[PDB]
Amino acid sequence: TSVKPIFSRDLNEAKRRVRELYRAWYREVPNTVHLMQLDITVKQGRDKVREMFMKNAHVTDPRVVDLLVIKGKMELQETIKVWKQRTHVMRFFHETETPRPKDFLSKFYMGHDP
Amino acid sequence: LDGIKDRVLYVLKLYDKIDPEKLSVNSHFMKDLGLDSLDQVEIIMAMEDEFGFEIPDIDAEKLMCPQEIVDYIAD
Amino acid sequence: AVIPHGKGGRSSVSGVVATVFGATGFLGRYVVNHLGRMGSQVIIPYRCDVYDIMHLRLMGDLGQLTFLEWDARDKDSIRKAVQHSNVVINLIGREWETRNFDFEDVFVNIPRAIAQASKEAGVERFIHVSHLNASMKSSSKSLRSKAVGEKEVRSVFPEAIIIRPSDIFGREDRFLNHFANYRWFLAVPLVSLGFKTVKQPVYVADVSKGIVNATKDPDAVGKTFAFTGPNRYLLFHLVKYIFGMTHRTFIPYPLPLFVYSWIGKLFGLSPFEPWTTKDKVERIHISDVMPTDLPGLEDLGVQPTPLELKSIEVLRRHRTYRWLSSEIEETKPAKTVNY
Amino acid sequence: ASATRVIQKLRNWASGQDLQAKLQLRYQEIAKRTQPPPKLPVGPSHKLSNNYYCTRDGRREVVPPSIIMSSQEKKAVTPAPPMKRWELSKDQPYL
Amino acid sequence: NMTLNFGPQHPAAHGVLRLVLELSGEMVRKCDPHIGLLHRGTEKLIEYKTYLQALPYFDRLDYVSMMCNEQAYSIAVEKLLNIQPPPRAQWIRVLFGEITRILNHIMAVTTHALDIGAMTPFFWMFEEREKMFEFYERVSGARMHAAYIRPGGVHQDLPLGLLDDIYEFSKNFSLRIDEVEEMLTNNRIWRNRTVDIGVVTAEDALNYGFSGVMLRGSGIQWDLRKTQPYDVYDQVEFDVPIGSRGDCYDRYLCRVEEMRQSLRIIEQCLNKMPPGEIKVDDAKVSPPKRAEMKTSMESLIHHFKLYTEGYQVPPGATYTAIEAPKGEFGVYLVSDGSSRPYRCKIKAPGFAHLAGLDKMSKGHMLADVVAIIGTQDIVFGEIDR
Amino acid sequence: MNLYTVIFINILLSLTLILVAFWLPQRLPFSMKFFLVAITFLLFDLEIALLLPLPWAIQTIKTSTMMIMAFILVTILSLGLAYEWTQKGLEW
Amino acid sequence: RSRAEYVVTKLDDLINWARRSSLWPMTFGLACCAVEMMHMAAPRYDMDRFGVVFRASPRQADVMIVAGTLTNKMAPALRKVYDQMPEPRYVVSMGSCANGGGYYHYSYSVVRGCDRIVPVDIYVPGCPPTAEALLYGILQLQRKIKREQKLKIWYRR
Amino acid sequence: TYKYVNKKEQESEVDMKSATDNAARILMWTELIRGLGMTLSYLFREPATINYPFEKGPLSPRFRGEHALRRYPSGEERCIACKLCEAICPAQAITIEAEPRADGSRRTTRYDIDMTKCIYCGFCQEACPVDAIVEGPNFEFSTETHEELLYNKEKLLNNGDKWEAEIAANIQADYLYR
Amino acid sequence: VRPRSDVTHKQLSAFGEYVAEILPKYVQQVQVSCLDELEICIHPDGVIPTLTFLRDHTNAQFKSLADLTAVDVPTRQNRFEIVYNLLSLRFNSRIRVKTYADELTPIDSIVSVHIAANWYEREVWDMFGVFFFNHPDLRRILTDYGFEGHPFRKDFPLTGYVELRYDDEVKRVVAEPVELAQEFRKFDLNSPWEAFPA
Ligand SMILES: NC(=O)C1=CN([C@@H]2O[C@H](COP(=O)(O)OP(=O)(O)OC[C@H]3O[C@@H](n4cnc5c(N)ncnc54)[C@H](OP(=O)(O)O)[C@@H]3O)[C@@H](O)[C@H]2O)C=CC1
Ligand SMILES: COC1=C(OC)C(=O)C(CC=C(C)C)=C(C)C1=O
């Protein structure tokens, strides 16, 4: 315990920042899908944003959250100030890779080490 | 104002998750109709468009029922 | 056999050594893609100069793709290609009867010799591809001839899977690009003003994935699957929709086919790959058959992908700078016809 | 080389320098190949006597850093003597 | 501001550079150079490689000054082992170090001109550069990427004809500098393109960590070769070519002078190279001679262990800086007692210089930026590492 | 006609090339400086015009007036240039 | 000789000679192999003699020489420049860094070969592949371009 | 010792003669003409290029070039699979697995140098005790396909047999140095 | 055996004491290596203060920042060991000030003290993940635009988790989990025998 605060004194204040970033991404998804001529649906993309913002829903510690948005903000900057081209963005969608089943029987049938 | 309220209701009706039936000016989706925190933020965003008015998070967080939205939109 | 080891991506092994004679094709390109992604051993018989098959090299890994010189008239070339393959996939097809190859050859004659040898070799399974709705009596010589083949090959190779795809939707496809390219033509002829020839497109990948899944599944033997699609369409919406995404005017004007078969004959005379074919024309206005058959997609494991979803990518090259940024959402969808 | 005198004279003039004296192309001035076999010298430590390694192994006679001011009147001292000003060259001070 | 990126394929971008330029009209108001296009992981790979098998990596960080780069690792590892190279080896490293600064400067001056538009200076000097590589190849076997300068001493003795051939090259090389000297030093067109462009003030240069010809060009007098004499730079006499004002011309003129001063140092090295051994005689640090390992057991054991396992340098950490042609090249090698390093931070004269591009290229045209990168002599191998 | 004959061959030769070339194979960049130059250019281009008849005007019987006129034109435009220099114009 | 086959063999021989004699290469300029070619462009081993252009923009380039490591940040670009080159186009992979990952194979930031990104025609080996060695590789591309028989294949197709 | 480049020692006050000389330098582009003279001069110099196929740029004995595995004059391959050539390879290029041959001798069942992985350092040449793996002179081994560049024992042994005569001469010239 | 002059080990040692005395609130340890190099060690809070004193003190002018790096000792609670190497062109001496930073306990930025650090601090964030407060523009410099993970951390796999290839189906470069065709052979090299007391 006894940790020093990075930018947010408590999960509460930190959550404020997450809200802002969500908004940012939400407002940006449409633009990217147009400035990058990505073949995705704005709605679809906006769900992806939600996915990511929740993939890390479990974090309880304020410090971890604060870094997470710093990093998140940095990603947005790379996508609104466009330095990240389609190949970079579409990677988020994991479009080419073949999905792996998580069913035990499925894995048994395919991989030595699951 | 009633029309404004209609606009508010209109937006909600549009949002997918919100259920038209449960929807009522007194419904608090955050606690009632089951909208997630993030969803509430998204709703406010749609309102910001329909009403062309920006809402600070501080206040937006305070707005969790459509009536409350109407009230803020009012002022 | 080859025990399948690995995590599933390139540089891994799946144990499918497969001759694929017509890989250079639009469908082919995709077939080699998945086979290579999975890690299968792919032998690609080719006749066109090496320059044209370079696009296939990066697909697949080192020592996973082997290219062999092969001539259809020369039986020996087919013989050595299948020497060490255990799966043979036949995608040999064309739309324009070429001077030295007739629809029979490209569809029935050659695809027979091939499977014939494959058996002599002892290949476990042969997949033969023939166009959808292919009656031995269908109007287009092409479709009928293809039908003739699916029969024969069964006698040369029993229990040989016969996937029968509809016209395919994909980048570099004809079905979608052809119509979109009618732009050059000021008017876009459409027999019966593009009506009563409901058509069900199928994404190329879906077809490819399906085909690949066949190679690695015991359920398919003697099966005549039909990869069809996720939605049917009267040719009218399709044509306009295309023009819609291309953002180019749509001027549907009906043209009596009897005269139009003649237009196909005209371009057909072209020495360099006639753009339209008498046999094409008929095919285009040949109504898509109904879906009562060994199911293909989904049945073989891939859920079809709606046309509108990826249409944007196929038709983008045809737009103008003005519309390049435009997106699918801005445009409208076409309407299906369960009929 | 192998240039008619006139071309050389034009060359030297147009360039403004006796380029012939210092040609870039190499001709029979470069060290011949197959120079004689080399018997290289063996250095120190090859003595067969009084050559104990313990007396010639700086590798690990090195010790852990010396520590000052560990946490666990007086004149001011600089990192080192103030540097000495460099002096202008004498062959070619300027240019 | 019409954002435009100086994309990698463009020749002026050194192959990998994505300068996001904001063009306020043709005048460029901001640059945000996006390096990283050649980051190879050079310093995470070294942690997994023994000290000798990581030497090669140092020849590929700045790829135009190979041996001077591998003289910084060699000095570092040598410090951490409290071993010193034999006298002949130190002269050979100074001989090869100045051949590399002539080689880097011919690279920097001629390619800068290629960018500005002068094409002939590159061809005349590049023929003089293959003459020089030959010296690398004749001493190591590789035209570039030699691996000759080893962590202790150098690898093999100079072939018996090299010093005569280095004299013949050095004897006639100065006319070759004189010739581009006439063709690109007074041309009003060069001066106009180079003079008063990218002026950097003295204190700003120290603050931005420029540390190189960029430091010396604005008049600060700092050469790690005279201030902190590494190897034998205490027994050779040379004049640091300090420039006065800082424009890209004064920096060019300084680079042309250092080529001339290096010929003065190369002369001294050929005139005074000592008879002796080229690698320290401790079999523990430098591998045993081919005949010895094939006739004496102590030598085979020492050859087997050194090649298979390593020197096992004593635990410690050092930052050793040498004056690489670009500027101060330093290796912060942290070492556990293990034969393979723990960290190797390559300070690249170039990471600091490219940072200065935004400040230096201020109130300047699209064309000036091409000169600004050219006068930093930036090779992206060192910056990207 | 003789010119017409030559010119159409000239276009034909070029159209032939491009045709074979295509057949054998088988947003806000603005700086007033740029606009300003174009303008100056015409002010100078117009003057070139008022100066072009000078070869015929040399033979004019007056002569004195010719030169008096021509010298005034060149001088007044050059002063225009002078003020262009003095002002930020021509200083890009 | 008289045969539609002979006329179609001789005319590609003509088309192949033109592409072979004038290959305008486009060097990305990654890492150091670009230097070992700047030496090929230089006077000891002129490339122009052979009909090679020292500097050619992508749209006017017949050959792309990938010299140097193709990091995972330059890959997305190489493909773009390869994709934007005119159709008749060929790739020469120079350096063990490009044809295969070379030193830096196991790095997390280096693509293990440009063959993964762009189809490669001739692979020139060597850490700094010597400049003659590149010149041999370019000459090997010319031998590959002579053998191609595009017109013959169209005639018997 | 330092040296000022581009530092004007003093302010030479303009003298008409000086001014004229200068003005002439700007007006009649005198220095520009000086530059043209230099290039005209070389136009007359002999070009340094070599006919590449017919003539070859000189490489001395230590040139590393292409890997080869040598054999004893008797015909027994030199390698005895000590596998330290694998240990010191910086790039992880050489892969060696061995087993006692029927004769009972030690030999490598598989020796694979991945040349695309190899960075031609020449340490393997250095490390081998029997000096079985050597850096051969040939540099021209460019290959159409990536697989050809990967080399197994048979290609290297064959490479060794083809270039053994020159490899022996090269090692003969440089062994005293090593 | 290298020649060592104790003049320096004495000069530098004294300076160390001088710095320590002047900045006792932050200096924890000040040592001189056997290689005559000083290495004041400061509490992370003393980043701004200790540097500034060295950049602007008449008796210790340390004008240029040679390098900013972060070794990562995973065992150490504070994982990173930010090391700043400085040079004094006036006194021809270098010093190193090294602090400790854990993954989520950021260090102050010295871009104010030396603008050289603007880039190196971005380099330390990209590779190791330490964060620098008050940095003008902290953003990945060396890694790819979409890279996930900090690479030079000792806990990051060399080959990494993603590699790129061109896929025809999608006609675009596409990441895939890394699949290597010859894994990095991990030779164990440490010998079971020590060398000296050290
Ligand atoms: N819309 C569609 O694409 C549909 C296709 N199909 C079937 O799927 C198969 C693949 O179609 P698709 O890829 O579009 O066809 P393509 O026109 O792309 O050609 C397929 C391949 O067949 C090869 N080929 C054609 N003729 C000959 C010949 N005489 N000798 C040797 N090889 C030959 C071609 O090689 P090369 O170019 O080197 O000669 C090519 O690589 C076809 O057989 C077709 O019947 C069925 C329904 C719809
Ligand atoms: C000397 O500095 C550099 C160049 O510019 C002159 C580059 O062109 C290039 C790359 C250039 C090409 C296109 C060969 C590199 C690698 C370089 O280091």
Ligand code: SF4
């Ligand atoms: S191959 Fe050798 S030389 Fe070419 S880039 Fe990679 S390392 Fe530098």
Ligand code: SF4
């Ligand atoms: S070192 Fe020489 S001998 Fe020992 S294995 Fe490698 S090659 Fe064979």
